[PDB]
UniProtKB/Swiss-Prot annotation:
Its EC number is 3.2.1.17. Changing residue 117 to I: 500-fold decrease in enzymatic activity. The gene is E. Signal peptide: none annotated. GO terms for cellular component: host cell cytoplasm. GO terms for molecular function: lysozyme activity. It catalyses: Hydrolysis of (1->4)-beta-linkages between N-acetylmuramic acid and N-acetyl-D-glucosamine residues in a peptidoglycan and between N-acetyl-D-glucosamine residues in chitodextrins. PANTHER family: T4-TYPE LYSOZYME 1-RELATED. It is found in: Host cytoplasm. Changing residue 11 to A/F/H/M/N: Complete loss of enzymatic activity. Substrate binds at residues 32, 104, 117, 132. This is Endolysin.
Length: 162
């Protein structure tokens, strides 16, 4: 297991524009296109992202290309963020992937605001951090996925993805 396999499990693979769990136009492996309710706006973002006229459909290789860019972008966001980088640097590789997962889903700014959870993670108070992480809109709206990510923070194992 690794961050790419982890996020493929959590995000799936769809080659046509679909709406994600928040109702937003998405494609590929969790590649958010736009929060606009306009399908034409999402198609325009998609064409720009892929570099050709797609009319809403892409290939598996194209989906994996956006996925690599998006994982890269999550790591880049963590390392440039004054709140996330110390936490990330403090963690083992399995728990680092749990943090990348959260940033992929909610964005750098969203996760950086989890101030109390981030502190419990930095203190390595794993059960307390896990309890705090679940007191969130994130957990209530996507509980099965949040439970997998939280179990990864709590244990430092891949047991929730086996």
């Amino acid at each position: 297991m690794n961050i790419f396999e982890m996020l493929r499990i959590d995000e799936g693979l769809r080659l046509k524009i679909y709406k994600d769990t928040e109702g937003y136009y998405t494609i590929g492996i969790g590649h958010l296109l736009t929060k606009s309710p306009s399908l034409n706006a999402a198609k325009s973002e998609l064409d720009k992202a892929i570099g050709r006229n797609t009319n809403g459909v892409i290939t598996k290789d194209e989906a994996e290309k956006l996925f690599n860019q998006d994982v890269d972008a999550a790591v880049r966001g963590i390392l440039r963020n004054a709140k996330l980088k110390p936490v990330f640097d403090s963690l083992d590789a399995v728990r680092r992937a749990a943090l990348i997962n959260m940033v992929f889903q909610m964005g750098e700014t969203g996760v950086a605001g989890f101030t109390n959870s981030l502190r419990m993670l930095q203190q390595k108070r794993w059960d307390e951090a896990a309890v705090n992480l679940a007191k969130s809109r994130w957990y209530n709206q996507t509980p099965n996925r949040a439970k997998r990510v939280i179990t990864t923070f709590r244990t430092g194992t891949w047991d929730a993805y086996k």
